[PDB]
Design an enzyme around this catalytic site. Structure first.
Site, PDB file in Angstrom:
ATOM      1  N   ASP A 108      -7.021   8.475   0.297  1.00 42.23           N
ATOM      2  CA  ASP A 108      -5.907   7.358   0.797  1.00 42.23           C
ATOM      3  C   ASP A 108      -4.741   7.748   1.947  1.00 42.23           C
ATOM      4  O   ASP A 108      -3.855   8.143   1.506  1.00 42.23           O
ATOM      5  CB  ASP A 108      -5.856   6.132   0.317  1.00 42.23           C
ATOM      6  N   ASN A 167      -9.130   5.246   3.910  1.00 42.74           N
ATOM      7  CA  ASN A 167     -10.010   6.063   3.398  1.00 42.74           C
ATOM      8  C   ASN A 167     -10.764   7.094   3.870  1.00 42.74           C
ATOM      9  O   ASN A 167     -11.013   6.637   4.852  1.00 42.74           O
ATOM     10  CB  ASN A 167     -10.071   4.827   1.933  1.00 42.74           C
ATOM     11  N   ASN A 200      -8.208   9.966  -5.068  1.00 42.81           N
ATOM     12  CA  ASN A 200      -8.629   8.480  -5.374  1.00 42.81           C
ATOM     13  C   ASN A 200      -9.712   9.839  -6.711  1.00 42.81           C
ATOM     14  O   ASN A 200     -10.538  10.618  -6.306  1.00 42.81           O
ATOM     15  CB  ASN A 200      -9.678   7.270  -4.745  1.00 42.81           C
ATOM     16  N   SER A 215     -12.290  11.408  -1.880  1.00 48.95           N
ATOM     17  CA  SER A 215     -11.653  10.390  -1.418  1.00 48.95           C
ATOM     18  C   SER A 215      -9.554  10.477  -1.843  1.00 48.95           C
ATOM     19  O   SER A 215      -9.260  10.365  -2.391  1.00 48.95           O
ATOM     20  CB  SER A 215     -11.813   8.921  -0.939  1.00 48.95           C
ATOM     21  N   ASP A 234     -12.611   9.607  -6.956  1.00 51.43           N
ATOM     22  CA  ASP A 234     -13.489   9.912  -6.290  1.00 51.43           C
ATOM     23  C   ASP A 234     -14.425  11.382  -4.665  1.00 51.43           C
ATOM     24  O   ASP A 234     -14.864  11.595  -4.647  1.00 51.43           O
ATOM     25  CB  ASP A 234     -14.626   8.434  -4.926  1.00 51.43           C
ATOM     26  N   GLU A 294       0.872  -1.408   0.486  1.00 54.20           N
ATOM     27  CA  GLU A 294      -0.117  -0.086   0.113  1.00 54.20           C
ATOM     28  C   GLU A 294       0.986   1.320   0.674  1.00 54.20           C
ATOM     29  O   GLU A 294       0.474   2.252  -0.766  1.00 54.20           O
ATOM     30  CB  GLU A 294      -0.778   0.042   1.338  1.00 54.20           C
TER      31      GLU A 294
HETATM   32 MG   LIG Z   1      -2.879   1.685  -2.456  1.00 54.20          MG
END
Ligand SMILES: [Mg+2]
Ligand SMILES: [Cl-]
Ligand SMILES: [Cl-]
Length: 129
Positions: free
Chosen positions: A52, A59, A46, A50, A48, A35
């Site tokens: 992370d 998220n 992202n 959002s 959308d 990650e």
């Molecule tokens: Mg990721």
């Protein structure tokens, strides 16, 4: 902070992630590796709106509040900034909440795509925990 593999494994063991709700420690180290590259300050925005956040790329729609994400649920009851701390305590607490749900570690796309089906125990080999 960019943790080393064994440093992170020790910190995660200390906070009770080893075999938490069916996921051995190596799963958590593997997920953090893919990650974020073990980086507490990682961020990825992202499609959308959002973002992370942090070492486990948690998220902002579902889990933490960043004041910037529509339809945010803040299920971990935290500002997303706590997930950019060098101390992983808040991220681990939130991760435990996430993994309690029916998706399990599929909440983490990199776990689903990179860790699932692999020999995750290799991530803790050679470490002093
Ligand atoms: Mg990721
Ligand atoms: Cl393991
Ligand atoms: Cl907890």
């Amino acid at each position: 902070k960019v943790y080393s593999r064994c440093e992170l494994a020790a910190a995660m063991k200390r906070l009770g992630l080893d075999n938490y709700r069916g996921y051995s420690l190596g799963n958590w180290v593997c997920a953090a590796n893919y990650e974020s590259g073990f980086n507490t300050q990682a961020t990825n925005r992202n499609t959308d709106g959002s973002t992370d956040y942090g070492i486990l790329q948690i998220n902002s729609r579902w889990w933490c509040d960043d004041g910037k994400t529509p339809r945010s649920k803040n299920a971990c009851g935290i500002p997303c900034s706590v997930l950019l701390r060098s101390d992983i305590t808040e991220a681990v607490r939130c991760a435990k909440r996430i993994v309690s749900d029916g998706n399990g570690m599929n909440a983490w796309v990199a776990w689903r795509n990179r860790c699932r089906g692999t020999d995750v125990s290799k991530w803790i080999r050679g470490c002093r925990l």
